[PDB]
Design an enzyme around this catalytic site. Sequence first.
Site, PDB file in Angstrom:
ATOM      1  N   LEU A  36       0.943  -0.715  -0.318  1.00  0.00           N
ATOM      2  CA  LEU A  36      -0.183   0.045   0.571  1.00  0.00           C
ATOM      3  C   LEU A  36       1.053   1.443  -0.063  1.00  0.00           C
ATOM      4  O   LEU A  36       0.399   1.973  -0.980  1.00  0.00           O
ATOM      5  CB  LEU A  36      -0.713  -0.156   1.482  1.00  0.00           C
ATOM      6  CG  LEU A  36      -2.143  -1.075   1.267  1.00  0.00           C
ATOM      7  CD1 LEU A  36      -2.910  -1.364   2.725  1.00  0.00           C
ATOM      8  CD2 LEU A  36      -2.948  -1.007   0.038  1.00  0.00           C
ATOM      9  N   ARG A  60       5.125   3.374   1.372  1.00  0.00           N
ATOM     10  CA  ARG A  60       6.672   2.811   2.285  1.00  0.00           C
ATOM     11  C   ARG A  60       6.846   4.234   3.028  1.00  0.00           C
ATOM     12  O   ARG A  60       6.394   5.106   1.938  1.00  0.00           O
ATOM     13  CB  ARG A  60       7.326   2.714   1.379  1.00  0.00           C
ATOM     14  CG  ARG A  60       7.734   3.217   0.181  1.00  0.00           C
ATOM     15  CD  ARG A  60       8.987   2.919  -0.134  1.00  0.00           C
ATOM     16  NE  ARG A  60       9.497   4.220   0.873  1.00  0.00           N
ATOM     17  CZ  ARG A  60      10.166   5.010   0.922  1.00  0.00           C
ATOM     18  NH1 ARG A  60       9.556   6.139   0.575  1.00  0.00           N
ATOM     19  NH2 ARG A  60      10.037   6.026   1.368  1.00  0.00           N
ATOM     20  N   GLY A  61       7.837   3.889   4.053  1.00  0.00           N
ATOM     21  CA  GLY A  61       7.798   5.456   4.389  1.00  0.00           C
ATOM     22  C   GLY A  61       9.468   5.074   4.458  1.00  0.00           C
ATOM     23  O   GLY A  61       9.904   3.783   4.480  1.00  0.00           O
ATOM     24  N   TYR A 108      10.739   4.676   7.831  1.00  0.00           N
ATOM     25  CA  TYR A 108      10.725   3.465   8.562  1.00  0.00           C
ATOM     26  C   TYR A 108      10.077   2.392   9.048  1.00  0.00           C
ATOM     27  O   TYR A 108       9.505   2.059   9.081  1.00  0.00           O
ATOM     28  CB  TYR A 108      11.096   4.346  10.028  1.00  0.00           C
ATOM     29  CG  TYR A 108      12.270   5.426  10.760  1.00  0.00           C
ATOM     30  CD1 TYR A 108      13.107   5.445  10.055  1.00  0.00           C
ATOM     31  CD2 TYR A 108      11.281   6.534  10.350  1.00  0.00           C
ATOM     32  CE1 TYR A 108      13.831   6.333  10.281  1.00  0.00           C
ATOM     33  CE2 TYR A 108      12.202   7.833  10.928  1.00  0.00           C
ATOM     34  CZ  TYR A 108      13.059   8.021  10.390  1.00  0.00           C
ATOM     35  OH  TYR A 108      14.449   8.730  11.288  1.00  0.00           O
ATOM     36  N   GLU A 127       7.756  -0.030   6.046  1.00  0.00           N
ATOM     37  CA  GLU A 127       6.182  -0.242   4.783  1.00  0.00           C
ATOM     38  C   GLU A 127       5.104  -0.788   5.096  1.00  0.00           C
ATOM     39  O   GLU A 127       4.748  -1.460   5.936  1.00  0.00           O
ATOM     40  CB  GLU A 127       6.986  -1.544   3.877  1.00  0.00           C
ATOM     41  CG  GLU A 127       8.087  -1.090   3.773  1.00  0.00           C
ATOM     42  CD  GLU A 127       8.278  -1.745   2.148  1.00  0.00           C
ATOM     43  OE1 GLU A 127       7.965  -2.541   1.688  1.00  0.00           O
ATOM     44  OE2 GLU A 127      10.346  -1.620   1.666  1.00  0.00           O
ATOM     45  N   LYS A 183       2.002  -3.489   9.322  1.00  0.00           N
ATOM     46  CA  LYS A 183       3.068  -2.340   9.141  1.00  0.00           C
ATOM     47  C   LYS A 183       4.290  -2.642   9.229  1.00  0.00           C
ATOM     48  O   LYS A 183       4.479  -3.544  10.772  1.00  0.00           O
ATOM     49  CB  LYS A 183       2.407  -1.132   9.462  1.00  0.00           C
ATOM     50  CG  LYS A 183       3.709  -0.331   9.786  1.00  0.00           C
ATOM     51  CD  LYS A 183       3.483   1.029  10.537  1.00  0.00           C
ATOM     52  CE  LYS A 183       4.308   2.312  10.861  1.00  0.00           C
ATOM     53  NZ  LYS A 183       3.369   3.510  11.630  1.00  0.00           N
ATOM     54  N   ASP A 218       1.297  14.834  13.252  1.00  0.00           N
ATOM     55  CA  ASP A 218       1.541  13.987  11.593  1.00  0.00           C
ATOM     56  C   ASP A 218       0.096  14.744  10.815  1.00  0.00           C
ATOM     57  O   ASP A 218      -0.233  13.144  10.406  1.00  0.00           O
ATOM     58  CB  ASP A 218       2.165  13.013  11.691  1.00  0.00           C
ATOM     59  CG  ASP A 218       2.676  12.618   9.807  1.00  0.00           C
ATOM     60  OD1 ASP A 218       2.969  14.256   9.080  1.00  0.00           O
ATOM     61  OD2 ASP A 218       3.082  11.907   9.864  1.00  0.00           O
TER      62      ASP A 218
HETATM   63 BR1  LIG Z   1      -4.563   0.816   8.433  1.00  0.00          BR
HETATM   64  C1  LIG Z   1      -2.983   1.844   8.079  1.00  0.00           C
HETATM   65  C2  LIG Z   1      -2.253   1.950   9.624  1.00  0.00           C
HETATM   66  C3  LIG Z   1      -0.864   2.380   9.875  1.00  0.00           C
HETATM   67  N1  LIG Z   1      -0.111   3.095  10.650  1.00  0.00           N
HETATM   68  N2  LIG Z   1       0.733   4.018  10.497  1.00  0.00           N
HETATM   69  N3  LIG Z   1       0.483   3.485   8.562  1.00  0.00           N
HETATM   70  C4  LIG Z   1      -0.008   2.943   8.137  1.00  0.00           C
HETATM   71  N4  LIG Z   1      -1.629   2.386   7.672  1.00  0.00           N
HETATM   72  C5  LIG Z   1      -2.460   2.379   7.129  1.00  0.00           C
HETATM   73 BR2  LIG Z   1      -3.495   1.946   6.049  1.00  0.00          BR
END
Ligand SMILES: Brc1cc2[nH]nnc2nc1Br
EC number: 2.7.11.1
Length: 327
Positions: free
Chosen positions: A40, A42-43, A45, A47, A63, A151
């Site tokens: 879905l 990525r960041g 720290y 995925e 996650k 955030d």
């Molecule tokens: Br559900 C969900 C929960 C998350 N927490 N951090 N990133 C996230 N992405 C999704 Br999609």
Amino acid sequence: GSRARVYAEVNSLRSREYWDYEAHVPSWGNQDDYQLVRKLGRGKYSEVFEAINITNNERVVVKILKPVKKKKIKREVKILENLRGGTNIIKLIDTVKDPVSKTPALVFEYINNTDFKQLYQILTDFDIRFYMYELLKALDYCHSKGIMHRDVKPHNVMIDHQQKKLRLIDWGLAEFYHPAQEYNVRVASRYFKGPELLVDYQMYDYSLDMWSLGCMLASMIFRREPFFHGQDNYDQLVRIAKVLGTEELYGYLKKYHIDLDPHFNDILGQHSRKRWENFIHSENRHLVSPEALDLLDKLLRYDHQQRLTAKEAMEHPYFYPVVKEQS
Ligand SMILES: Brc1cc2[nH]nnc2nc1Br
Ligand SMILES: [Cl-]
Ligand SMILES: [Cl-]
Ligand code: NA
């Protein structure tokens, strides 16, 4: 120094174990129960994947965390466990590890969200009131639990526009509020950073999230997304000051004894405070009302201590139609 007008002492009134996340010992279950289906996002720290729990056939989101950031992992886990059951906060279902590599992952409820770029184009007046009210419930809840999200932005507010469900996600930057604590200002997306962050004022609080929320409200009623579109963190403050005014910025800095990075000298200029009505035109007039502008004016304020709390915002007349419908 500065302190929160609400919830200021809430963590100090709780057991140390509530907020002492470095001492938290998560219970790590087995990731082998989950089948990854689709990436879905990525960041830095993490995925994120859609997945199926093979033991009960439930769709979930997984996650996967970079295991190196151990203190930050405990922080996010403890915050999510403290927020369990909170209204419109994404539900943490499981904390799991690869049983061999010991890489940790968080398992969340699934939500079938409508991408905000598409969604924000079709929202009605009532839709905006409704979804802003639901987001405020999440922020009032986490603030009451002594937690700053740090955030808030459209990408972290998942909306299923068919079932009318909203979840505030990505708690990886969230922190516990403690009076007089100085916090890292390198939080939030550029476009949603409060002026306190942009002027390096570390003694901030839950009201940071209320700035970010106001930015979202403005983008939704005015259909300018993001509303303050800086090219870097310096320009971001310039974009804000163009609207809220420079003399008002200087009064804020003076009140809190804030020293302004001298690079701002060459870029801030001189700007009147603008009337919020200046943003209305034919494409957004149906989303704007006196009550929307009054609310926005009380959120997008330099002085973090004068911004509405989440509760005060929920109590504003702008949301009366939503409260009435929910009766
Ligand atoms: Br559900 C969900 C929960 C998350 N927490 N951090 N990133 C996230 N992405 C999704 Br999609
Ligand atoms: Cl911090
Ligand atoms: Cl502008
Ligand atoms: Na697995």
